[PDB]
Amino acid sequence: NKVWVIGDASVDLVPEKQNSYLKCPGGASANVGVCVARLGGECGFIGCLGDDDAGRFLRQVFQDNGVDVTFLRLDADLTSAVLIVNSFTYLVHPGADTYVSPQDLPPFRQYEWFYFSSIGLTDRPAREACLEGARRMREAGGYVLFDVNLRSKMWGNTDEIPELIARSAALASICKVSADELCQLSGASHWQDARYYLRDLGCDTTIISLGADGALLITAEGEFHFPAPRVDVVDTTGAGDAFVGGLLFTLSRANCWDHALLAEAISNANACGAMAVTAKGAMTALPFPDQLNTFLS
Amino acid sequence: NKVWVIGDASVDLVPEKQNSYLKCPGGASANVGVCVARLGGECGFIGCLGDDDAGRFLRQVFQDNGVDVTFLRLDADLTSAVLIVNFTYLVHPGADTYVSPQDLPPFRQYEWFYFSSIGLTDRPAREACLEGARRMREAGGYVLFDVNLRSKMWGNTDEIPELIARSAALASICKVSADELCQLSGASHWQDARYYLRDLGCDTTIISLGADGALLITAEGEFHFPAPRVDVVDTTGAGDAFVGGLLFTLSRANCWDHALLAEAISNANACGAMAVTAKMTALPFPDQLNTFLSSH
Ligand SMILES: [K+]
Ligand SMILES: [K+]
Ligand SMILES: [K+]
Ligand SMILES: [K+]
């Protein structure tokens, strides 16, 4: 089954010396799409980008990775995002990725997956596109994966976040969150004191990440933990996207899913989450089918 | 006497190796400040930049060159400009654009204040510039208006003719380019337009001609200063280098007279060439300037 990712794609400039930036492809939604594609899965990107430099560059990157771009439109009246890893400093104000809208949605099919995060929720056009997209995917008999990739500093009135988060866990088949983001949401200092936070918001399945520590699967059979490989950081950029990437690649192999698949899924997550940190780009060390096993064992 | 430059400070991204850009210091007001500094003059930058990588990067370049940054304010809610060439922009609010009148320092007799239309395009910056010129004049100081016309960057191209004239009014000396004259006057030949600013209140005008040097317009008449012979390869930042060397001279005294004004333009043409011949950055140090003024 096909995995549809909707959201941001951008150029990330990460330093090296005391006078230069390394140009890498990026965007939470882009990283995830390229991750799922590289693992041999079938993935499609739904979004907007300007018909500019950054636009065509990132577009090309999708093609070189096997990511369907039929529904990725490039508007010349727009400018594609560019940030600088220093921990992010965004440069483009409205950000082309925020212009995607319900018209840009592809017809959905049974058992397919729809992915989106709060980043897709910041500005209006996109916001509608995401929530409608999830609505249609569920109506089509499909699954929605909401990654509450909380980006406080990107929002205009942080007084919309708690509300849009709840309406996503609602539509969401599976919600993925980080230890930090839970605390930062529940207002709690100990995530564990509020780890049924999303569940009580409408989502029955939660996958809470924990760094080089792994993840915590929270369904109803109980809380299951998974270990993260021996880390050796080089650039933490995109660990989270690689994690969700491997997660969808797996879930997408079946039509239905249970703890079983949910465990092989999270194992792939923790794995793809560790590797990616080894390189210096958000999606530089995203594994191929043959590089994943060599690292696995 | 100290030279105060107010305006743009941005990080220019230039292609390089493989999918890697390199930081380049830039900004008409920045280049000038660095120019004046390098030549062993006393210069201070008044402006804004984000406290982002760039913002702090630029502050460094200013320090490594002897440019006072006491009045260079680094905000957090702002974002320093960044351009990518191959000159497409990215940051539109523009941090350097948030500089305001309360970021201005105290001026003192015989000091120079510099600014261009680039500083006049967005709001806080615009007030900051006109107020800065007003104060420097009241302090018995000097103002150098460089009508560095950037039609594109301007939102309402109608505000330009008006802001240029109000500026000429405050200026002690106005610097303009041959084409810049044609743009405002609308004439094809600039000579038919050499009094455009004169009629706007500026008694002294320096019209840059590039390779042909420079024409000076004053009450007593106009005098031509030819340019040094060089292999023209890259004209970037030539204008900033020209104005930089110009301020570095007029400051070395209290009240420029026939002779100092005469030598200032020679420094300008000079500093303006080292640019077109070499690789901004083409700014020289006193040692290199001299070895050039001669056999070079
Ligand atoms: K749900
Ligand atoms: K990385
Ligand atoms: K005047
Ligand atoms: K040049």
PDB file of all heavy atoms in Angstrom, chain B residues 101-122:
ATOM      1  N   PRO B 101      15.262  55.179  15.217  1.00  0.00           N
ATOM      2  CA  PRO B 101      15.891  56.360  15.803  1.00  0.00           C
ATOM      3  C   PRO B 101      16.501  56.186  17.207  1.00  0.00           C
ATOM      4  O   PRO B 101      17.442  56.911  17.567  1.00  0.00           O
ATOM      5  CB  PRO B 101      14.764  57.384  15.758  1.00  0.00           C
ATOM      6  CG  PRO B 101      14.087  57.038  14.466  1.00  0.00           C
ATOM      7  CD  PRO B 101      13.987  55.535  14.570  1.00  0.00           C
ATOM      8  N   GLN B 102      15.991  55.244  17.998  1.00  0.00           N
ATOM      9  CA  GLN B 102      16.537  55.037  19.341  1.00  0.00           C
ATOM     10  C   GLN B 102      17.754  54.108  19.362  1.00  0.00           C
ATOM     11  O   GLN B 102      18.226  53.708  20.429  1.00  0.00           O
ATOM     12  CB  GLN B 102      15.460  54.500  20.285  1.00  0.00           C
ATOM     13  CG  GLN B 102      14.482  53.560  19.624  1.00  0.00           C
ATOM     14  CD  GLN B 102      13.321  54.300  18.999  1.00  0.00           C
ATOM     15  OE1 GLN B 102      13.505  55.332  18.356  1.00  0.00           O
ATOM     16  NE2 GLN B 102      12.115  53.771  19.180  1.00  0.00           N
ATOM     17  N   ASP B 103      18.247  53.762  18.175  1.00  0.00           N
ATOM     18  CA  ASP B 103      19.421  52.912  18.026  1.00  0.00           C
ATOM     19  C   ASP B 103      20.547  53.809  17.543  1.00  0.00           C
ATOM     20  O   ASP B 103      21.659  53.357  17.296  1.00  0.00           O
ATOM     21  CB  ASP B 103      19.184  51.818  16.988  1.00  0.00           C
ATOM     22  CG  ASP B 103      18.076  50.866  17.380  1.00  0.00           C
ATOM     23  OD1 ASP B 103      17.300  51.187  18.309  1.00  0.00           O
ATOM     24  OD2 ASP B 103      17.982  49.793  16.742  1.00  0.00           O
ATOM     25  N   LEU B 104      20.235  55.091  17.399  1.00  0.00           N
ATOM     26  CA  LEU B 104      21.207  56.070  16.946  1.00  0.00           C
ATOM     27  C   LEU B 104      22.095  56.496  18.116  1.00  0.00           C
ATOM     28  O   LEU B 104      21.630  56.596  19.245  1.00  0.00           O
ATOM     29  CB  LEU B 104      20.479  57.297  16.377  1.00  0.00           C
ATOM     30  CG  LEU B 104      19.694  57.158  15.068  1.00  0.00           C
ATOM     31  CD1 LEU B 104      18.837  58.391  14.824  1.00  0.00           C
ATOM     32  CD2 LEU B 104      20.678  56.945  13.918  1.00  0.00           C
ATOM     33  N   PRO B 105      23.390  56.729  17.867  1.00  0.00           N
ATOM     34  CA  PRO B 105      24.265  57.148  18.963  1.00  0.00           C
ATOM     35  C   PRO B 105      24.309  58.671  19.022  1.00  0.00           C
ATOM     36  O   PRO B 105      23.562  59.352  18.318  1.00  0.00           O
ATOM     37  CB  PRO B 105      25.605  56.559  18.561  1.00  0.00           C
ATOM     38  CG  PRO B 105      25.586  56.729  17.101  1.00  0.00           C
ATOM     39  CD  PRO B 105      24.191  56.275  16.718  1.00  0.00           C
ATOM     40  N   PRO B 106      25.177  59.230  19.874  1.00  0.00           N
ATOM     41  CA  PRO B 106      25.272  60.685  19.971  1.00  0.00           C
ATOM     42  C   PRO B 106      26.283  61.153  18.932  1.00  0.00           C
ATOM     43  O   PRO B 106      27.378  60.587  18.827  1.00  0.00           O
ATOM     44  CB  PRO B 106      25.796  60.910  21.384  1.00  0.00           C
ATOM     45  CG  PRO B 106      25.660  59.578  22.051  1.00  0.00           C
ATOM     46  CD  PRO B 106      25.918  58.606  20.974  1.00  0.00           C
ATOM     47  N   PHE B 107      25.923  62.178  18.165  1.00  0.00           N
ATOM     48  CA  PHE B 107      26.827  62.694  17.150  1.00  0.00           C
ATOM     49  C   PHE B 107      27.624  63.865  17.710  1.00  0.00           C
ATOM     50  O   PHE B 107      27.208  64.527  18.666  1.00  0.00           O
ATOM     51  CB  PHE B 107      26.043  63.149  15.916  1.00  0.00           C
ATOM     52  CG  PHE B 107      25.154  62.087  15.329  1.00  0.00           C
ATOM     53  CD1 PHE B 107      23.795  62.321  15.154  1.00  0.00           C
ATOM     54  CD2 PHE B 107      25.675  60.854  14.941  1.00  0.00           C
ATOM     55  CE1 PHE B 107      22.969  61.346  14.600  1.00  0.00           C
ATOM     56  CE2 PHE B 107      24.850  59.870  14.383  1.00  0.00           C
ATOM     57  CZ  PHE B 107      23.498  60.121  14.214  1.00  0.00           C
ATOM     58  N   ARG B 108      28.777  64.117  17.112  1.00  0.00           N
ATOM     59  CA  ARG B 108      29.615  65.217  17.559  1.00  0.00           C
ATOM     60  C   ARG B 108      30.252  65.950  16.385  1.00  0.00           C
ATOM     61  O   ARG B 108      30.662  65.343  15.391  1.00  0.00           O
ATOM     62  CB  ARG B 108      30.685  64.711  18.540  1.00  0.00           C
ATOM     63  CG  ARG B 108      31.266  63.363  18.185  1.00  0.00           C
ATOM     64  CD  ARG B 108      32.097  62.756  19.308  1.00  0.00           C
ATOM     65  NE  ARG B 108      33.477  63.244  19.341  1.00  0.00           N
ATOM     66  CZ  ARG B 108      33.871  64.398  19.878  1.00  0.00           C
ATOM     67  NH1 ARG B 108      32.992  65.216  20.445  1.00  0.00           N
ATOM     68  NH2 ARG B 108      35.157  64.734  19.851  1.00  0.00           N
ATOM     69  N   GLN B 109      30.306  67.271  16.519  1.00  0.00           N
ATOM     70  CA  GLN B 109      30.863  68.159  15.519  1.00  0.00           C
ATOM     71  C   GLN B 109      31.970  67.541  14.657  1.00  0.00           C
ATOM     72  O   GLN B 109      32.874  66.843  15.155  1.00  0.00           O
ATOM     73  CB  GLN B 109      31.369  69.428  16.204  1.00  0.00           C
ATOM     74  CG  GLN B 109      31.878  70.482  15.251  1.00  0.00           C
ATOM     75  CD  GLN B 109      32.306  71.740  15.972  1.00  0.00           C
ATOM     76  OE1 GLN B 109      33.120  71.690  16.897  1.00  0.00           O
ATOM     77  NE2 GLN B 109      31.761  72.882  15.551  1.00  0.00           N
ATOM     78  N   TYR B 110      31.854  67.804  13.352  1.00  0.00           N
ATOM     79  CA  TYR B 110      32.785  67.351  12.322  1.00  0.00           C
ATOM     80  C   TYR B 110      32.709  65.867  11.959  1.00  0.00           C
ATOM     81  O   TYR B 110      33.571  65.354  11.241  1.00  0.00           O
ATOM     82  CB  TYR B 110      34.223  67.716  12.713  1.00  0.00           C
ATOM     83  CG  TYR B 110      34.433  69.192  12.969  1.00  0.00           C
ATOM     84  CD1 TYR B 110      35.032  69.636  14.151  1.00  0.00           C
ATOM     85  CD2 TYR B 110      34.037  70.146  12.031  1.00  0.00           C
ATOM     86  CE1 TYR B 110      35.232  70.999  14.395  1.00  0.00           C
ATOM     87  CE2 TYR B 110      34.232  71.510  12.264  1.00  0.00           C
ATOM     88  CZ  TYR B 110      34.832  71.930  13.447  1.00  0.00           C
ATOM     89  OH  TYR B 110      35.049  73.271  13.669  1.00  0.00           O
ATOM     90  N   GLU B 111      31.681  65.178  12.440  1.00  0.00           N
ATOM     91  CA  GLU B 111      31.527  63.754  12.138  1.00  0.00           C
ATOM     92  C   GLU B 111      30.716  63.516  10.864  1.00  0.00           C
ATOM     93  O   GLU B 111      29.924  64.362  10.457  1.00  0.00           O
ATOM     94  CB  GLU B 111      30.867  63.029  13.323  1.00  0.00           C
ATOM     95  CG  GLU B 111      31.862  62.365  14.275  1.00  0.00           C
ATOM     96  CD  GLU B 111      31.236  61.886  15.588  1.00  0.00           C
ATOM     97  OE1 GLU B 111      30.010  62.055  15.795  1.00  0.00           O
ATOM     98  OE2 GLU B 111      31.991  61.342  16.424  1.00  0.00           O
ATOM     99  N   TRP B 112      30.925  62.367  10.229  1.00  0.00           N
ATOM    100  CA  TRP B 112      30.176  62.041   9.020  1.00  0.00           C
ATOM    101  C   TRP B 112      29.106  60.969   9.226  1.00  0.00           C
ATOM    102  O   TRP B 112      29.315  59.982   9.924  1.00  0.00           O
ATOM    103  CB  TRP B 112      31.105  61.588   7.884  1.00  0.00           C
ATOM    104  CG  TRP B 112      31.883  62.692   7.238  1.00  0.00           C
ATOM    105  CD1 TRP B 112      33.067  63.205   7.661  1.00  0.00           C
ATOM    106  CD2 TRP B 112      31.516  63.442   6.066  1.00  0.00           C
ATOM    107  NE1 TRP B 112      33.467  64.228   6.829  1.00  0.00           N
ATOM    108  CE2 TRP B 112      32.533  64.394   5.843  1.00  0.00           C
ATOM    109  CE3 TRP B 112      30.426  63.403   5.188  1.00  0.00           C
ATOM    110  CZ2 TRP B 112      32.496  65.301   4.779  1.00  0.00           C
ATOM    111  CZ3 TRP B 112      30.388  64.307   4.130  1.00  0.00           C
ATOM    112  CH2 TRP B 112      31.418  65.241   3.937  1.00  0.00           C
ATOM    113  N   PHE B 113      27.953  61.197   8.609  1.00  0.00           N
ATOM    114  CA  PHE B 113      26.837  60.267   8.642  1.00  0.00           C
ATOM    115  C   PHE B 113      26.607  59.823   7.200  1.00  0.00           C
ATOM    116  O   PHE B 113      26.502  60.657   6.304  1.00  0.00           O
ATOM    117  CB  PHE B 113      25.577  60.954   9.146  1.00  0.00           C
ATOM    118  CG  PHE B 113      24.381  60.057   9.184  1.00  0.00           C
ATOM    119  CD1 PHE B 113      24.291  59.036  10.123  1.00  0.00           C
ATOM    120  CD2 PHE B 113      23.334  60.229   8.278  1.00  0.00           C
ATOM    121  CE1 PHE B 113      23.163  58.193  10.166  1.00  0.00           C
ATOM    122  CE2 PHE B 113      22.209  59.396   8.309  1.00  0.00           C
ATOM    123  CZ  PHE B 113      22.126  58.379   9.255  1.00  0.00           C
ATOM    124  N   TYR B 114      26.536  58.517   6.977  1.00  0.00           N
ATOM    125  CA  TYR B 114      26.315  57.985   5.637  1.00  0.00           C
ATOM    126  C   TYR B 114      25.053  57.152   5.559  1.00  0.00           C
ATOM    127  O   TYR B 114      24.715  56.440   6.504  1.00  0.00           O
ATOM    128  CB  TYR B 114      27.501  57.117   5.203  1.00  0.00           C
ATOM    129  CG  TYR B 114      27.172  56.165   4.067  1.00  0.00           C
ATOM    130  CD1 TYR B 114      27.532  56.467   2.760  1.00  0.00           C
ATOM    131  CD2 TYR B 114      26.464  54.981   4.296  1.00  0.00           C
ATOM    132  CE1 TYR B 114      27.198  55.622   1.705  1.00  0.00           C
ATOM    133  CE2 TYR B 114      26.123  54.127   3.250  1.00  0.00           C
ATOM    134  CZ  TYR B 114      26.498  54.456   1.953  1.00  0.00           C
ATOM    135  OH  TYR B 114      26.189  53.618   0.901  1.00  0.00           O
ATOM    136  N   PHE B 115      24.363  57.233   4.425  1.00  0.00           N
ATOM    137  CA  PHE B 115      23.152  56.447   4.205  1.00  0.00           C
ATOM    138  C   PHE B 115      22.723  56.510   2.744  1.00  0.00           C
ATOM    139  O   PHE B 115      23.100  57.424   2.020  1.00  0.00           O
ATOM    140  CB  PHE B 115      22.008  56.910   5.131  1.00  0.00           C
ATOM    141  CG  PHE B 115      21.333  58.170   4.697  1.00  0.00           C
ATOM    142  CD1 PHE B 115      20.045  58.128   4.180  1.00  0.00           C
ATOM    143  CD2 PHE B 115      21.968  59.402   4.827  1.00  0.00           C
ATOM    144  CE1 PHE B 115      19.389  59.303   3.800  1.00  0.00           C
ATOM    145  CE2 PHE B 115      21.327  60.581   4.453  1.00  0.00           C
ATOM    146  CZ  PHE B 115      20.033  60.535   3.939  1.00  0.00           C
ATOM    147  N   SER B 116      21.949  55.522   2.310  1.00  0.00           N
ATOM    148  CA  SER B 116      21.480  55.465   0.931  1.00  0.00           C
ATOM    149  C   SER B 116      19.992  55.204   0.884  1.00  0.00           C
ATOM    150  O   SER B 116      19.348  55.041   1.915  1.00  0.00           O
ATOM    151  CB  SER B 116      22.207  54.358   0.160  1.00  0.00           C
ATOM    152  OG  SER B 116      21.983  53.085   0.743  1.00  0.00           O
ATOM    153  N   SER B 117      19.451  55.164  -0.324  1.00  0.00           N
ATOM    154  CA  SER B 117      18.035  54.911  -0.506  1.00  0.00           C
ATOM    155  C   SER B 117      17.664  53.504  -0.044  1.00  0.00           C
ATOM    156  O   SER B 117      16.497  53.223   0.232  1.00  0.00           O
ATOM    157  CB  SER B 117      17.664  55.116  -1.968  1.00  0.00           C
ATOM    158  OG  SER B 117      18.727  54.688  -2.781  1.00  0.00           O
ATOM    159  N   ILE B 118      18.659  52.624   0.050  1.00  0.00           N
ATOM    160  CA  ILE B 118      18.398  51.271   0.504  1.00  0.00           C
ATOM    161  C   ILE B 118      17.884  51.370   1.931  1.00  0.00           C
ATOM    162  O   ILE B 118      16.983  50.642   2.320  1.00  0.00           O
ATOM    163  CB  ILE B 118      19.666  50.405   0.457  1.00  0.00           C
ATOM    164  CG1 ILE B 118      20.216  50.380  -0.973  1.00  0.00           C
ATOM    165  CG2 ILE B 118      19.346  48.978   0.908  1.00  0.00           C
ATOM    166  CD1 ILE B 118      21.574  49.670  -1.127  1.00  0.00           C
ATOM    167  N   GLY B 119      18.451  52.285   2.707  1.00  0.00           N
ATOM    168  CA  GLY B 119      18.006  52.465   4.076  1.00  0.00           C
ATOM    169  C   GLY B 119      16.651  53.149   4.138  1.00  0.00           C
ATOM    170  O   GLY B 119      15.938  53.062   5.146  1.00  0.00           O
ATOM    171  N   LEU B 120      16.285  53.810   3.044  1.00  0.00           N
ATOM    172  CA  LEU B 120      15.023  54.544   2.958  1.00  0.00           C
ATOM    173  C   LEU B 120      13.772  53.788   2.483  1.00  0.00           C
ATOM    174  O   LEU B 120      12.670  54.346   2.477  1.00  0.00           O
ATOM    175  CB  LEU B 120      15.220  55.764   2.058  1.00  0.00           C
ATOM    176  CG  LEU B 120      16.055  56.920   2.609  1.00  0.00           C
ATOM    177  CD1 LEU B 120      15.916  58.087   1.662  1.00  0.00           C
ATOM    178  CD2 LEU B 120      15.570  57.315   4.024  1.00  0.00           C
ATOM    179  N   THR B 121      13.931  52.522   2.116  1.00  0.00           N
ATOM    180  CA  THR B 121      12.813  51.756   1.586  1.00  0.00           C
ATOM    181  C   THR B 121      11.773  51.173   2.551  1.00  0.00           C
ATOM    182  O   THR B 121      10.583  51.128   2.228  1.00  0.00           O
ATOM    183  CB  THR B 121      13.321  50.622   0.680  1.00  0.00           C
ATOM    184  OG1 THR B 121      12.194  49.959   0.105  1.00  0.00           O
ATOM    185  CG2 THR B 121      14.155  49.620   1.460  1.00  0.00           C
ATOM    186  N   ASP B 122      12.201  50.720   3.722  1.00  0.00           N
ATOM    187  CA  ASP B 122      11.251  50.150   4.668  1.00  0.00           C
ATOM    188  C   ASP B 122      11.120  51.117   5.822  1.00  0.00           C
ATOM    189  O   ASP B 122      12.008  51.932   6.021  1.00  0.00           O
ATOM    190  CB  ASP B 122      11.728  48.772   5.109  1.00  0.00           C
ATOM    191  CG  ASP B 122      11.786  47.784   3.948  1.00  0.00           C
ATOM    192  OD1 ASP B 122      11.973  48.230   2.797  1.00  0.00           O
ATOM    193  OD2 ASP B 122      11.659  46.562   4.182  1.00  0.00           O
TER     194      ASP B 122
END
